[PDB]
Design a protein around this ligand. Structure first.
Ligand SMILES: Cc1cc2nc3c(=O)[nH]c(=O)nc-3n(C[C@H](O)[C@@H](O)[C@@H](O)COP(=O)(O)O)c2cc1C
Ligand SMILES: Cc1cc2nc3c(=O)[nH]c(=O)nc-3n(C[C@H](O)[C@H](O)[C@H](O)COP(=O)(O)O)c2cc1C
Ligand SMILES: Cc1cc2nc3c(=O)[nH]c(=O)nc-3n(C[C@H](O)[C@H](O)[C@H](O)COP(=O)(O)O)c2cc1C
Ligand SMILES: Cc1cc2nc3c(=O)[nH]c(=O)nc-3n(C[C@H](O)[C@H](O)[C@H](O)COP(=O)(O)O)c2cc1C
Lengths: 188, 193, 205, 207
């Protein structure tokens, strides 16, 4: 085709960035896909800034945002608030949408951040994909871990110093491959 | 054929009427098989008493499942909740993973759970690993501003009024037909690949 | 007195009109001080003027801007935001993202929090915008108040209307041309009075 | 008159019951208060209760009186406990609440404090969404919603796996229900009970 997977993210201290690398790695496990990383501007490198126009080109868009009190961050919100023209044109209708996040605390918006993000994706006419429980990481009870059936996640700790765990990255890779696979099936 | 199940609870018929519209829409897609299934209870229901009962096991046969429930204070009704609470074995084996899931509802008032009933339902569908489909704004009914209307981007809906005397409007039923066709199209694309 | 702050963002004035009604309701309770505050705009200068938003916003230009610090002084904060695809708008999001210091100091813990919104379509985030907003208020340790069904407006079935048990709302139509109805404003007044009453009861401990 | 707190819960294997006793202990700390635990009726067929072992586990708290919809009107605050079922409250709790249409139309719960706690098998399988979806129902009832403020240190624990959310206390049962509530989880529940009781008392003594 190739099937086009965009990973649109904002990262403050690298947790979402590292998770985005993992989502990307997973999507890249599926043949005939083109993975494009896009970063969200604040209010170097060759990761372009997301624009509303470019989102139209995707078959799937996987969004990553750190939480801000259980909602997506203002940087992501501001970017999405600029997609009214894209909405008017039906630009994302029928495309696969998926979300991953990061939080400071164990249950401070690990889930709510994602489900509230889903709302916006639904207004854009997207089909929503999370992480199924066929991924063993989701049921881990041996170590503190992110990862939700709604989408992958990581924990940054109170001071932002915690690095994403191998369990959390595995879940994100799973999410990427799963989203890419569904998108490819829908696109062919 | 692509298999679509429409699994619903209805007390006074509003959700049943919507389910028939969903079904009509689904059947507008080639090579699909659409089955209405009613959720067991824990006069109006006799008017559709020839619809078979849904069982948790049979869900595994569908490519898409479209769930209908009246609201109960912004959540699905207990009859539906009890049905879904019986899908633990199906969850264990990953029986609904990758199947298309979609929801429609009915409420008494204009903003008493027209949306929250559906989004809380989506939570459960995601635990089952389903692909969630709502109603895109390509459906004009969603932006109707000339009459009181159900219909949400999260899924179709109708309004029954305080006494339950209001019947689904043409606009609400057309939105439901669209959802049925939309879901069946997406499911067919998945089932064939 | 019991202090009620109504913090809002508005682009074309719908939320601002609802905010005035919320204020009016809150004032119906004795010994209350009600203050409107607005959040900073993020939209580029040229976009504001090109979209006609600059003109509408200039209408309420005299309203002071909220700051994180000032929020501490309230007994209740009622937040108004237009929906953006079923979430609060980025202007409100950015203001709240600046309240980390306030969060660390537990500055809004035990305060009454409440929300109202505005949407283009009948069921395009009339409810989900508000419930997602509640999430944030809970992280701040706020007590959440909506609109009880003792307000008859919530069950009106004779005319298209905003108003939810989660918080008041209005509908702006596809072109934004619809203005708040009397039913919608009445529900907002009730919300304001209901919130103020709860806040007063809690504050006078 | 004493502030009245009801803790209304469903439990299959006892996790929610244990959290409920911790919530109650916390509520009792405020003084001039009456805290009552009430359980909702079981829906599971008798044979299933027996073969699943649930009959036996529930018997451990079988003497807790059963809540009825009308009794809820007696409380200043109601704290609801439910295990998650795929990120919603369980059907037992749902059926009980579906029976509160009378209270709803009479405004019987308006202005009362409502609060929620939960239990899940996995770390992020509905620890939050079960609670936020519950809040929807409580808002239809016109209740004042209270969660758990971050003044509770347990919420930011990053040394051990723990439940506890700013939306309400929670515990983790593990994939097979083998995990029992931790001290951290019970501490958070205790705080929730005290916090809810404090808010309710302030509202109650200011009629
Ligand atoms: C970028 C953008 C996205 C919007 N998305 C929706 C939407 O998805 N659903 C909806 O019903 N209204 C939507 N609206 C409409 C509004 O929220 C807004 O026009 C209306 O509430 C006016 O409030 P205000 O005059 O205070 O700004 C959107 C508006 C904008 C600018
Ligand atoms: C303003 C602000 C508010 C936050 N509030 C919460 C919160 O309430 N609960 C929580 O668990 N984490 C909260 N966080 C934590 C972050 O989201 C965390 O820093 C993030 O996961 C870091 O990932 P990043 O490096 O990609 O930005 C907050 C962070 C910020 C900046
Ligand atoms: C116990 C109960 C609680 C209800 N609560 C609400 C409510 O809070 N908000 C609302 O808008 N409708 C509420 N309803 C109304 C319905 O959901 C309505 O009867 C339904 O749409 C009927 O569809 P059906 O005929 O297919 O069962 C409630 C109904 C019942 C029985
Ligand atoms: C039908 C069913 C579905 C469940 N689904 C989930 C789930 O999706 N996510 C989760 O984390 N736990 C899930 N659980 C596990 C429980 O909720 C857990 O066993 C419960 O908290 C035990 O509390 P109790 O002993 O008070 O009943 C499910 C349990 C059952 C029976």
């Amino acid at each position: 085709m190739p099937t086009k997977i965009q990973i649109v993210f904002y990262s403050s201290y690298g947790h979402i960035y590292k998770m985005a690398e993992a989502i990307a790695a997973g999507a890249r496990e599926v043949g005939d896909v083109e993975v494009t990383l896009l970063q969200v501007p604040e209010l170097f490198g060759s990761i372009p800034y997301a624009t509303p126009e470019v989102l139209a080109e995707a078959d799937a868009i996987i969004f990553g945002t750190p939480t801000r009190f259980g909602n997506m961050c203002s940087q992501m919100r501001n970017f999405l608030d600029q997609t009214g023209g894209l909405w008017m044109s039906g630009g994302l209708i029928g495309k696969v949408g998926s979300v991953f996040t990061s939080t400071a605390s164990q249950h401070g918006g690990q889930e709510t951040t994602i489900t509230s993000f889903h709302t916006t994706l639904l207004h854009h006419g997207m089909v929503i994909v999370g992480v199924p429980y066929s991924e063993p990481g989701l049921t881990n009870m041996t170590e503190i871990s992110g990862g939700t059936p709604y989408g992958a996640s990581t924990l940054a700790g109170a001071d932002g110093s915690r690095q994403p765990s191998e369990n959390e990255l595995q879940i994100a890779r799973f999410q990427g491959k799963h989203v890419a696979t569904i998108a490819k099936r829908l696109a062919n």
